[PDB]
Amino acid sequence: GFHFQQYIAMAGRAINPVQWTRAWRRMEGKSATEVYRDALAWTNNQFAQISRASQYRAWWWQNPLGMGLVLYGTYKAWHMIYMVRKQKKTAQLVAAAYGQGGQWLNPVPR
Amino acid sequence: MWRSSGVSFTRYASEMAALLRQCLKEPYRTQAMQRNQIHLKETVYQQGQVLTRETFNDIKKAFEA
């Protein structure tokens, strides 16, 4: 992993409506195949930078587990940001619709 | 702009009159840039003992140096 700050900055630029107009203008004379190939090349460039530079270079976050810890932390951040938020929303929905624990209730006795 | 930029009104006026002369018509522009060439030789002193001597043929370098 690397360039997390740059990834945040990319998302920040993407959410800017001015950058939406810039991309609209840049999209003149352009194909979906070209866009997909560009994105794939960018991702390959990232992973190739990793594959090459891990052989000789160590980041400030280097640790006895290497990139496993960075990838675990990425996963956990994604989890806590998205999935637990969704769980909160689903909990309030179920609690308003059936009550707490309504999805694990037993079938109605016959 | 000049008391802020550390520039004199005479310097500003001269450097703008230069442009106005550059915006002339060739028959009169010839006589204008003729009558407004430059040739000076500054000689700096400090209790005798000349510190430096320098020539000047341009208005901008004459005001700069």
């Binding site: 900055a9 998302a11 920040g12 630029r13 270079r57 806590m80 | -």
Partner: protein, 52 residues
Amino acid sequence: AVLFDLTEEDCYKYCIRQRAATPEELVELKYTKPKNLVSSYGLCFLGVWFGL
């Protein structure tokens, strides 16, 4: 390029390849200020706000 009568482009590429051959040595770039700090702050606030 001037010593071997080659093109400065080719000599530049050769030099770059030979420096990449020894990439443990860091290279010196023009300093540029950071970018998108405000947007990054906003996204990181959103992150902590949903994640914690």
